[PDB]
């Protein structure tokens, strides 16, 4: 399973993930890729604000889903 995270500059991050991965896990991956602090990261999928403790599956994030790093 793979998901795409678009940075604030529109750069695409490709991540290998599992359905039970938490948002917090995803943030750790983004930090490895881009050097962005987890506490600086705010993610959206389908207009939903994503919380650290919830899983990709909780938010119906599927194979090939695209998340955005946002300011708000
Ligand atoms: Zn596993
Ligand atoms: Zn994982
Ligand atoms: Zn910090």
Curated annotation (Swiss-Prot):
Record membrane topology: Peripheral membrane protein
Outcome of substituting residue 68 to G: Loss of DTX3L-mediated polyubiquitination of histone H3 and H4
Domain Ubiquitin-like, chain residue ranges per copy: 1-72
Site feature (Essential for function) residues: 68
Positions of disulphide bridges: none
Residues with PTM (Microbial infection) ADP-ribosylthreonine: 66
Domain of life according to the entry: Eukaryota
Compartments in which it is found: Cytoplasm; Nucleus; Mitochondrion outer membrane
UniProt-annotated site: Interacts with activating enzyme, residues: 54, 72
Outcome of substituting residue 72 to G: No effect on ADP-ribosylation
Record PTM text: Phosphorylated at Ser-65 by PINK1 during mitophagy. Phosphorylated ubiquitin specifically binds and activates parkin (PRKN), triggering mitophagy. Phosphorylation does not affect E1-mediated E2 charging of ubiquitin but affects discharging of E2 enzymes to form polyubiquitin chains. It also affects deubiquitination by deubiquitinase enzymes such as USP30. Mono-ADP-ribosylated at the C-terminus by PARP9, a component of the PPAR9-DTX3L complex. ADP-ribosylation requires processing by E1 and E2 enzymes and prevents ubiquitin conjugation to substrates such as histones.
Record location of the Glycyl lysine isopeptide (Lys-Gly) (interchain with G-Cter in ubiquitin) cross-link: 6, 11, 27, 29, 33, 48, 63
PTM annotation (Phosphoserine): residues: 65
Function: Exists either covalently attached to another protein, or free (unanchored). When covalently bound, it is conjugated to target proteins via an isopeptide bond either as a monomer (monoubiquitin), a polymer linked via different Lys residues of the ubiquitin (polyubiquitin chains) or a linear polymer linked via the initiator Met of the ubiquitin (linear polyubiquitin chains).
Protein name per its UniProtKB record: Ubiquitin
Provenance organism: Homo sapiens (Human)
Gene: UBB
Residues of the full protein shown: 1 to 72 of 229
């Amino acid at each position: 399973m793979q998901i795409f995270v678009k940075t604030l500059t529109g750069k695409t991050i490709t991540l290998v993930v599992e359905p039970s991965d938490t948002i917090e896990n995803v943030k750790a991956k983004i930090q490895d890729k881009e050097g962005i602090p987890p506490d600086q990261q705010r993610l959206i999928f389908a207009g939903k604000q994503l919380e650290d403790g919830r899983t990709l599956s909780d938010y119906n994030i599927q194979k090939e889903s695209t998340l955005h790093l946002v300011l708000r």
